[PDB]
Amino acid sequence: QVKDAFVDYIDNPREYLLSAVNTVVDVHTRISDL
Amino acid sequence: LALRDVAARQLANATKTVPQLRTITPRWLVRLLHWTPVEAGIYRVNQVKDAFVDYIDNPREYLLSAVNTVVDVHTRISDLYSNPHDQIREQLRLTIEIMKERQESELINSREYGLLNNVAPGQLVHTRNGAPTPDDLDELLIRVWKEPAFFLAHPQAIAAFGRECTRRGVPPATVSLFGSSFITWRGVPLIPSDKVPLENGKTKILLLRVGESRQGVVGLYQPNLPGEQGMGLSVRFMGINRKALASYLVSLYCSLAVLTDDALAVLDNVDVTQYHTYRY
Amino acid sequence: LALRDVAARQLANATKTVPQLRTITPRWLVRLLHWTPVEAGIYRVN
């Protein structure tokens, strides 16, 4: 970002870290086989 | 007043290196040995008895040993942070480096196989004064007079031998191998290895003849493996657990056989802490 | 005196068989029945 918008930039810009969400899906092998 | 350096640096990429491991050694011994494949993990060494020609009825059999390591990587760490360096690739790379260091240490120091334990009586020499003088290395060269290949010693033992040579008038000759320089005595080079034990001084020096055709020392590996990332090495995917940890199995199969008993000699009780005072 | 039989046998391969299981039977009934496939595990006999 431009600071206080010479042209200066802020020295501590925000960084966005992607988050992970998980789900375990369990299926019996006889249910899928039959 | 103009743009700052830190503010401008916020827009710049850093050049990131792969992680550096300080315990990586050149591992000369593994490079110097000859490796023979063992088709199904058993290696029988037959011998002439009391060398008509008779054979011994109970030859020694070498069973290849397996060592394993489980490498766990979170799936979010490999999914998110794999640019420009693959996370799993580096994790397995460092694991395999550590495992090969352990493999060299076991080629020297194992209790089942391993040079320092499989040395025949009469092939063991002792130092006369404690420091590794040229006479001790000449004794070793007497024991393995046939076709010696190299000496194996701790780098501090090599420095002690050099100091003994400098006390005499002898500058030992030097040779270049693998782009590196080594000290030689009577044409047989001294190879460094920090895996040779050292306890309050008191290390050991080895002399080897290598090769299957010369009846020397040979290394043994398992030729065909699932995964098969190298000579006797395999990496296999184990699965993913309920916490999203992906696991990998790294397996290394190895052994070592001394074909005849005069292929290896050990100089024992070597002291590396002695320095000469030069007075003229 | 010459080379022995056991000493010479140390250099010979043995012919190893696959393990033998004595509980294997000819299982005639499975061979004699007719087998019909069931597409999704349910079979209704009207």
Side-chain angles (χ1 to χ4, degrees):
Chain A
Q1 293 198 334
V2 176
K3 163 145 62 164
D4 293 325
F6 74 115
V7 182
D8 210 12
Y9 315 145
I10 66 167
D11 49 331
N12 57 335
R14 181 168 182 187
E15 293 184 351
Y16 295 83
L17 297 171
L18 299 206
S19 51
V21 309
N22 297 309
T23 304
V24 177
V25 187
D26 308 311
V27 186
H28 289 294
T29 56
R30 76 179 181 279
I31 290 181
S32 49
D33 279 1
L34 288 174
Chain B
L1 192 62
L3 182 66
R4 308 177 174 194
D5 292 317
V6 40
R9 219 183 286 123
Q10 290 303 286
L11 275 66
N13 302 344
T15 299
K16 271 79 80 175
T17 84
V18 298
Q20 312 277 294
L21 186 53
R22 65 174 321 188
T23 56
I24 294 177
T25 56
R27 293 188 305 259
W28 300 120
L29 170 64
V30 185
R31 223 174 303 185
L32 289 162
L33 280 165
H34 297 209
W35 298 86
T36 88
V38 181
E39 294 303 319
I42 314 172
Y43 189 74
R44 183 190 301 172
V45 184
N46 295 305
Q47 293 198 334
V48 176
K49 163 145 62 164
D50 293 325
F52 74 115
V53 182
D54 210 12
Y55 315 145
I56 66 167
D57 49 331
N58 57 335
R60 181 168 182 187
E61 293 184 351
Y62 295 83
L63 297 171
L64 299 206
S65 51
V67 309
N68 297 309
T69 304
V70 177
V71 187
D72 308 311
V73 186
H74 289 294
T75 56
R76 76 179 181 279
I77 290 181
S78 49
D79 279 1
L80 288 174
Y81 304 140
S82 294
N83 199 318
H85 306 307
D86 195 8
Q87 298 284 328
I88 302 167
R89 185 206 62 229
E90 295 303 325
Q91 209 68 3
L92 291 177
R93 181 180 65 84
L94 305 175
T95 298
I96 294 179
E97 290 300 322
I98 302 179
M99 285 186 71
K100 289 176 180 314
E101 305 295 326
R102 182 60 179 169
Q103 171 204 17
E104 193 209 12
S105 186
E106 281 300 272
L107 287 171
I108 302 173
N109 292 290
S110 177
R111 296 296 293 187
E112 160 60 33
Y113 64 99
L115 304 156
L116 290 186
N117 293 282
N118 295 258
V119 50
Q123 293 296 296
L124 184 72
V125 202
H126 306 271
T127 52
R128 310 183 63 88
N129 325 94
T133 74
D135 303 14
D136 308 335
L137 260 56
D138 269 341
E139 281 291 312
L140 278 187
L141 286 178
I142 288 172
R143 298 305 191 280
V144 196
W145 71 272
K146 254 133 182 172
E147 276 167 72
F150 47 89
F151 291 98
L152 198 72
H154 205 286
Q156 289 180 38
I158 301 184
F161 174 73
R163 295 200 304 275
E164 290 313 310
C165 278
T166 305
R167 191 58 202 94
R168 290 85 181 160
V170 175
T174 64
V175 303
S176 300
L177 293 178
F178 307 106
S180 180
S181 303
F182 305 89
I183 275 299
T184 68
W185 187 247
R186 312 299 186 194
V188 186
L190 282 73
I191 296 294
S193 194
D194 58 322
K195 304 306 189 301
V196 183
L198 172 64
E199 283 195 351
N200 309 118
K202 307 311 183 304
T203 182
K204 288 172 180 180
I205 303 189
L206 302 81
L207 179 57
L208 279 74
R209 180 213 323 157
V210 296
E212 202 176 2
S213 58
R214 279 170 298 258
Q215 307 184 143
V217 181
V218 293
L220 307 168
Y221 72 97
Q222 181 62 45
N224 307 286
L225 293 170
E228 179 55 21
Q229 303 302 327
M231 190 196 63
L233 176 88
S234 69
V235 175
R236 275 176 296 191
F237 181 67
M238 280 165 49
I240 309 181
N241 73 339
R242 312 282 305 198
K243 302 308 177 191
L245 255 187
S247 294
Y248 295 79
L249 189 66
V250 186
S251 303
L252 186 55
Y253 304 87
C254 180
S255 207
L256 185 133
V258 184
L259 291 188
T260 47
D261 48 87
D262 61 3
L264 164 82
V266 170
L267 178 76
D268 193 1
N269 203 257
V270 174
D271 186 24
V272 304
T273 68
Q274 287 177 14
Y275 292 79
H276 287 288
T277 308
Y278 289 80
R279 285 174 280 195
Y280 303 100
Chain C
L1 192 63
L3 182 66
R4 308 177 174 194
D5 292 317
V6 40
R9 219 183 286 123
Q10 290 303 286
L11 275 66
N13 302 344
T15 299
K16 272 79 80 175
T17 84
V18 298
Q20 312 277 294
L21 186 53
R22 65 174 321 188
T23 56
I24 294 177
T25 56
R27 293 188 305 259
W28 300 120
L29 170 64
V30 185
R31 223 174 303 185
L32 289 162
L33 280 165
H34 297 209
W35 298 86
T36 88
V38 181
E39 294 303 319
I42 314 172
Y43 189 74
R44 183 190 301 172
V45 184
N46 295 305

